[PDB]
Design a protein around this ligand. Structure first.
Ligand SMILES: Nc1nc2c(ncn2[C@@H]2O[C@H](COP(=O)(O)OP(=O)(O)O)[C@@H](O)[C@H]2O)c(=O)[nH]1
Ligand SMILES: Nc1nc2c(ncn2[C@@H]2O[C@H](COP(=O)(O)OP(=O)(O)O)[C@@H](O)[C@H]2O)c(=O)[nH]1
Length: 405
């Protein structure tokens, strides 16, 4: 079940980023034990009728990248502007879209409170069927549009995926893992395997096990793998150090909420200073992923690779454990007893209970009075307290405050 990908396309200033923001998951109410993740303006996820969808704002990519996004998407949401009417640049985009071989949903944005007949008039001639009436500023028509997008769509064990930039060692590591002691192997995107009584499925969205067998980076296919997997193994290339692009990928993993293990690959042959330099770079540039187990390996020579299986099992178990309101509240009471919340404007903040908001991203909701006066430093203290109490690894703990009712 790979998530469908919807590419938002259209001229500048039609409302693509506004619609993207309306549809995607907001993380404004969350405070993490360690900050360091921003809101992605290119890729996101949305949910409509329980069906999760990947969204790409092609305006955030700006033509090579835009063309790649369109070619790798399942459907296309093409936005035009009711206030402008049909303009020549819309027609240029339309002709390009017709040559691709995919569904085009036409959406007329900025409809505001104008009648549909007025809004849609200029756009029937584009030949993309119904010009869906929307206003991204108010939500008008958005649910109806997304319902039409949905309607026009076609033992696993622990699912894992390798994520990383080109040439970091993904195919090498896949081949090495599948050949480790006691591993047995038996559409082509899923590769089931087992080790002892442990069942796994490798997710290979870019088909790299096949290219290695016989012989272009896709952020979309990386995101699809990340959302399909239970645990991600992110590979760094120790010879290159920590790169800006590595950080962009890691951030997306953390934002997606998926369990993470870091494999620092190509560790072989490095001297004491080289190794210490890589370690120091990780500590300086990646403290936001301290919750993730990391292993220094050589996929090529096999050194340290076997440690990954227990890391997969333990990371999965950590986020899958039972987390009742009673046990979360028991932990909250203990945290408060050890370190009392500060008085704010002279009034005491009273924290009453905690419940599980979500496992991905891990969100613990803390209820009380005057909770929004809680300094962010206290929220970070609570995040760390829950982390230690339940031994959360592979995912960061987020605290969401709620001042009931
Ligand atoms: N009146 C109106 N303005 C909108 C609507 N949606 C977006 N806008 C505005 O149109 C402008 C362009 O929007 P933006 O999302 O940046 O367009 P993009 O360049 O396609 O990403 C911004 O000022 C938005 O606030 C809408 O439904 N109605
Ligand atoms: N020295 C060394 N080279 C490696 C290691 N892992 C992969 N490589 C090399 O790095 C290159 C890219 O490996 P590959 O698995 O194709 O990377 P992918 O693009 O991430 O799938 C190849 O030349 C590999 O032999 C390693 O652990 N040590």
């Amino acid at each position: 079940a790979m998530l469908p990908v919807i590419a938002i396309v259209g001229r500048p200033n039609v409302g693509k980023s506004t619609l993207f923001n309306y549809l995607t998951k907001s993380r404004a109410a969350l405070v993490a034990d360690v900050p360091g993740v921003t809101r992605d303006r290119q890729y996101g996820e949305t949910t409509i009728d329980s069906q999760r969808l990947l969204l790409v704002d092609t305006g955030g990519l700006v033509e090579t990248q835009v063309e790649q996004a369109i070619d790798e998407s399942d459907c296309i949401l093409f936005l035009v502007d009711a206030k402008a009417g049909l303009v020549p640049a819309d027609e240029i985009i339309a002709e390009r879209l017709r040559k691709k071989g995919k569904k085009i949903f036409l959406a007329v944005n900025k409809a505001d409170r104008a009648r549909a007949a007025v809004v849609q008039s200029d756009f029937y001639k584009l030949g993309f069927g119904e010009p869906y009436v929307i206003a991204a500023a108010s939500g008008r028509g958005v649910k109806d549009l997304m319902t039409q997008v949905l309607e026009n769509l076609p033992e696993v064990g622990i699912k894992i995926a390798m994520i990383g930039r080109p040439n970091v060692g993904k195919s090498t590591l896949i081949n090495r893992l599948l050949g480790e002691e006691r591993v047995i192997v038996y559409d082509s995107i899923y590769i089931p395997f087992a080790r002892n009584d442990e069942n796994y499925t490798l997710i290979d969205t870019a088909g790299i096990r096949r290219r290695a067998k016989i012989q272009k980076f896709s952020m979309i296919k990386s995101l699809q793998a990340m959302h399909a997997a239970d645990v991600v193994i992110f590979l760094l290339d120790a010879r290159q150090g920590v790169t800006e692009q590595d950080l962009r990928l890691l951030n997306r993993i953390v934002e997606a909420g998926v369990s993470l293990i870091i494999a620092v690959n190509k560790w072989d042959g490095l001297n004491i200073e080289e190794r210490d330099n890589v370690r120091n770079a990780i500590d300086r540039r990646m403290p936001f992923v301290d919750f993730a187990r990391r292993y220094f390996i050589s996929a090529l020579h096999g050194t340290g690779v076997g440690k990954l299986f227990r890391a997969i099992q333990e990371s999965y178990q950590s986020i899958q454990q039972e987390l009742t309101t009673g046990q979360l509240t028991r932990a909250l009471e203990k945290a408060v007893a050890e370190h009392e919340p500060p008085l704010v404007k002279g009034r005491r903040i009273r924290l009453r209970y905690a419940h599980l908001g979500a496992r991905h991203p891990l969100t613990i909701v803390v209820h009380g009075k005057q909770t929004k006066s809680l300094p962010q430093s206290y929220s970070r203290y609570l995040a760390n307290y829950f982390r230690k109490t339940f031994n959360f690894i592979g995912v960061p703990v987020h605290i969401k405050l709620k001042t009931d009712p």
